[PDB]
């Protein structure tokens, strides 16, 4: 019994068990249930991280300390180590000798109680050929007799799926619900546990710091329950303060330190803005304008929304931004979104929405229901967001997607989280949701009847309203209608494409010089308001790339070439001069 089980009462005397703070209803229920018959044995079914082990182990510490009833004052508590019992069960009858011997000691004393943590495991523990014995069966007669009382703890899922299956054990055991405590109750627990953590790390936590940990952790960390989640910040905060300075100049834990620790655990960019990061944020609009010309309203909306999140003036349970980009073909809707990720140095979660045209395909985003071939792979959207909490979610061609797709996004915009088939929740608070749409684009290129063409921008918005539900538009932070590229804007676009060509030529050792007159000629030939910037690329391909390709493959530009481009005013045709150099 020395190795099979451990004496929790003795452990508390040496300080092994941590101090028990709170949970007075659970302790009261456990003690009263133990003394009475008719399911004397209490159970501690609760969710993970809710302190189930602390209630059973904290009871032994309380009994040795005092302030317990006389009947329970002398009741010693032991914990069953299932691994120890099976360590030496090589030969037949070893388990019987160990389990029966242990039960005899507990039963004969009549005041010893065994606390079997994770009691779901003992239901089995043996399937060897011939024996046909189990730990639960060995103790089933004793529990039915009621001579021996045993405490237990199990997860809610395990109790319903494992403990509930064995009606005999479930019938005897008395369930005691355990749930996450209140915010006030949790900070009190940390104060009670503050001497232990402070001693190990040689740090001191301020009253505000413990309060901040509970509020900040619950706000940003959702998967874990409140007791362990809040304590995880305290333990990590002490370690960081202890380990960060080699000189040990800073021993106390400031509130600012708690914020930084919570940020890394929850992978949120929200923190005090750094000088290096601050500079980049200021020039985000300027850099975006250099790459994407025009569409200033779109850039302003993205930059201002992102700035608010770092400043802290952001939606509590919604994404930083939910922008719908609708415009004519060829305008830089996708480019600004793609370039935004590069400028901000964050991953681009580009999800083409043409593939999700069918209703059944939407399950792919949130995962296939359990029990199918594709359940294991999981959702593509939730997994991507979990892997990259701070990222740009570019849902291009959202119009093509099935109406069911929009339903999923409605929850993300307001609730701020989406649950997959597995049940994990993805945090979209730091995700920049930009959905490009081509709705009402035919009207944009439609030429109205009459001498003077009419502005069909209003007609396009009506089509967008028809395709998108009113509730969907209300949730969106802003709807930006991209304007048609002007002649001045197109001139900048031509230069940008030439720069891309120059970079490609640099790889081959060729340098391209385009005169100002040549650039104007290219712009006029390819400038179409309806088609957009894309025709400019086609003009560059035929006029510039095609001649260079022949020379590059077979000609003067094969190695270390040079190029000059000028516009023949008399012939109104470009002249390409190649020097072998």
């Amino acid at each position: 019994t020395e190795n099979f089980t451990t004496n929790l009462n003795q452990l508390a005397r040496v300080g092994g068990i941590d101090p028990l703070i709170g949970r007075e209803k659970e302790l009261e229920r456990a003690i009263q249930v133990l003394c009475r018959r008719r399911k004397n044995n209490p159970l501690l079914v609760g969710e993970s991280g809710v302190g189930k082990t602390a209630i059973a182990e904290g009871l032994a510490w309380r009994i040795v300390q005092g302030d317990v009833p006389e009947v329970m004052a002398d009741c010693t508590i032991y914990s069953l180590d299932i691994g120890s019992l099976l360590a030496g069960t090589k030969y037949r009858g070893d388990f019987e000798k160990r389990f029966k011997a242990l039960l005899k000691q507990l039963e004969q004393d009549t005041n010893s109680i065994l606390f079997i943590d994770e009691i779901h495991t003992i239901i089995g523990a043996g399937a060897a050929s011939g024996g046909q014995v189990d730990a639960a069966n060995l103790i089933k007669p004793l529990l039915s007799s009621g001579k021996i009382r045993v405490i237990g703890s199990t997860t809610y899922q395990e109790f319903s799926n494992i403990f509930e299956k064995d009606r005999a054990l479930a019938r005897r055991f008395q369930k005691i619900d355990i749930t996450e405590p209140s915010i006030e109750e949790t900070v009190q627990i940390i104060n009670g546990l503050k001497p232990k953590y402070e001693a190990h790390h040689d740090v001191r936590y301020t009253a505000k710091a413990v309060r901040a940990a509970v509020e900040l952790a619950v706000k940003y960390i959702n998967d874990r329950h409140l007791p362990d989640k809040a304590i995880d910040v305290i333990d990590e905060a002490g370690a960081r303060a202890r380990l960060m300075p080699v000189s040990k100049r800073k021993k106390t834990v400031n509130v600012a330190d708690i914020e930084s620790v919570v940020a890394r655990i929850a992978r949120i960019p929200e923190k005090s803005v750094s000088q290096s990061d601050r500079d980049t944020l200021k020039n985000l609009g300027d850099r975006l304008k250099m790459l994407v010309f025009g569409q200033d309203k779109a850039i302003e909306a993205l930059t201002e929304a992102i700035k608010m999140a770092r400043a802290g003036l952001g939606h509590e349970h919604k994404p930083v931004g939910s922008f719908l980009f609708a415009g004519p073909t060829g305008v830089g809707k996708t480019e600004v979104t793609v370039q935004l990720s590069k400028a901000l140095g964050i991953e681009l979660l580009r999800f083409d929405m043409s593939e999700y045209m069918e209703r059944h395909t939407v399950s792919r985003l949130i995962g296939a229901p359990p029990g199918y071939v594709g359940f294991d792979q999981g959702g593509l959207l939730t997994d991507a967001v979990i892997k990259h909490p701070h990222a740009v979610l570019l849902l291009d061609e959202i119009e093509k997607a099935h109406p069911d797709v929009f339903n999923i996004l409605l929850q993300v915009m307001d609730n701020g989280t989406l649950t997959d088939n597995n049940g994990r929740k993805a945090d979209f608070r730091n995700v920049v949701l930009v959905m490009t749409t081509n709705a009402g684009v035919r009207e944009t290129e439609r030429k109205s009847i009459g001498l003077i063409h009419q502005d069909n921008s209003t007609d396009a918005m009506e089509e967008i309203k028809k395709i998108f539900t009113p509730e969907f538009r209300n949730r969106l932070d802003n709807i930006i209608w991209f304007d048609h590229l002007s002649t001045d804007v197109i001139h900048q676009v031509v230069d940008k494409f030439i720069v891309e060509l120059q970079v490609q030529l640099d790889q081959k050792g060729v340098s391209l010089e385009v005169s100002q007159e040549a650039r104007n000629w290219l712009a006029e030939k390819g400038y179409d308001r309806a088609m957009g910037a894309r025709p400019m690329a086609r003009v560059i391909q035929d006029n510039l790339k095609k001649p260079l390709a022949n020379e590059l493959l077979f000609g003067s530009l094969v190695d270390g070439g040079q190029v000059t481009v000028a516009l023949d005013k008399e012939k109104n045709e470009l002249t390409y001069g190649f020097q072998s150099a």
């Binding site: 090589k90 030969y91 037949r92 009858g93 070893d94 399937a127 060897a128 050929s129 069918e358 199918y372």
Partner: peptide, 18 residues
């Protein structure tokens, strides 16, 4: 009006007689 159609072995341990 299209319709979409949606679509034992364990190791054991031996104990020698004591």
């Amino acid at each position: 009006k299209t319709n979409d159609w949606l679509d034992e072995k364990v190791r054991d341990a031996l104990k020698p007689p004591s």
